[model samples]
Target: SMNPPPPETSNPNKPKRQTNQLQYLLRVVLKTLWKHQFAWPFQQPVDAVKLNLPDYYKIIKTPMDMGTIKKRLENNYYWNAQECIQDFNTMFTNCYIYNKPGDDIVLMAEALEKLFLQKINELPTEE
Candidate 1:
């Protein structure tokens, strides 16, 4: 061979090196999200069957949760950091759709959303 194949695959977390720094930023955001006081409701997928909310399946077309977001990050399911951040929006949107705006759980989601935006705002200075 005139030139050997590149060794791009050798690095750990080998997706989109261009956004490598941004990718790490999401990890920190996720860690803080999980650590949040209101994180319990969103830490995992909603137990639709156990909760027995038939209407939830009917209304919320997509479901998002912290565990799924973390899973997607590891799998490189996000095309870019924006897509990863958007998942948090989706999670909150799902919460808003499925519950009352004034409900305790919905309030928790709102608080978490505020925290997420605050975290994302940390990005501008990063570059």
Candidate 2:
């Protein structure tokens, strides 16, 4: 099995400093993602995804223009679910991870997330 380098092996000299900084950034990003992997947005127990689209939103938000979803996705630069979810998670984790929330907090979070996702999902990819 391949062994890993010791933690202190990361240097702070010139190229080493740049490399270490890059690695630190990458680690922070990946760890942040992993920390919230199962979390819908944060530790709100929105972990399990049922893919439930409200009947009304489904019927009303469905794009007649077809390019709506595509345009939004392109504009938002969310080419895939992983990208979109990760961004959403980053935002949620920052906002809700600590501050004490009030009643209906979870519902509000879910509603916001759903609305954000719909802005992408309703995009007209067929066009």
Candidate 3:
């Protein structure tokens, strides 16, 4: 059997970071959506824009055309689930993780889990 690297020996330059429940839940949600074909494991430029159409306006109250949104999405490209997770993690970290309090993070995680559960329940039984 291959032995794992000692945690102490792993990296002296950087501290190890533990993944929080919200991030883990997001990855789990992505996995389920991918398996059920509700989501693409890889990026689908047009589809992504269409799904989150109102967000371009709703979030910032700024109007944006499909072409511009598509161009932005294309610039920060993702070709698979791992890449998608990285993108999400980066955004979450910059916007929430450091700025938010612990209780808020937990609440967000709970809400995400509930939403994912509802989505999963709505999916048809596969043959």
Candidate 4:
């Protein structure tokens, strides 16, 4: 008879792996959204996009947007994008639950739009 498979133990790297995957998902989603909303002529380098803009602004726009998301994720948020990920998950789940086709995409785009626009309105007016 064949031996049974070994019992599973907790993997120390599991949390880090999940965090990385989550970050990757956020980057892809935001980049795609940016491409669609901004009418980019072509895709740019991942590093250029990653390091060149703020999370809130970069989710929709770039250049005029200041602060890289990587720094914010590391120093400010302390390497956790879980909260934002969870929010998007909840939004997506609700849309699916309601059986609303494409509503998830619509909601996500609208949410990013509102987020960036809200940030713009909050900034002080320069002469």
Q: Which candidate is the best by lDDT?
A: 1
Off by over 4 Å in 3: 1-76, 102-106, 113-127
Give Cα-based local distance difference scores for all models.
Answer: 0.73, 0.35, 0.35, 0.36
lDDT ranking from best to worst?
1, 4, 3, 2
- Model 4, 2-113: lDDT tens digits are 2222212233343432254335434554344444543231122223344442332233222111122322223333224454344344433433443346555445545565
Tens-place lDDT per residue, model 3, 29-107, is: 5445334432222222223244443332233222222233223333332233343334444333332332345655334
Worst 10 residues of 3 by lDDT: 1-10
Q: Which has the greatest TM-score? A: 1
Candidate RMSDs in Å, in order, are: 10.8, 17.8, 16.7, 18.2
User: In candidate 2, where is summed lDDT lowest over 10 consecutive residues?
Assistant: 61-70
- Model 2: residues with Cα > 4 Å off, grouped in runs: 1-72, 103-107, 114-127
Give me the displacement of residue 75 in model 2, in angstroms.
2.3
Error of 1 at 34 (Å): 0.7
Return the number of clashes found in candidate 2. 4
TM-score of each: 0.78, 0.26, 0.25, 0.25
lDDT of 4 at 119: 38
lDDT of 1: 0.73
Clash pairs (backbone) in predicted model 1: none
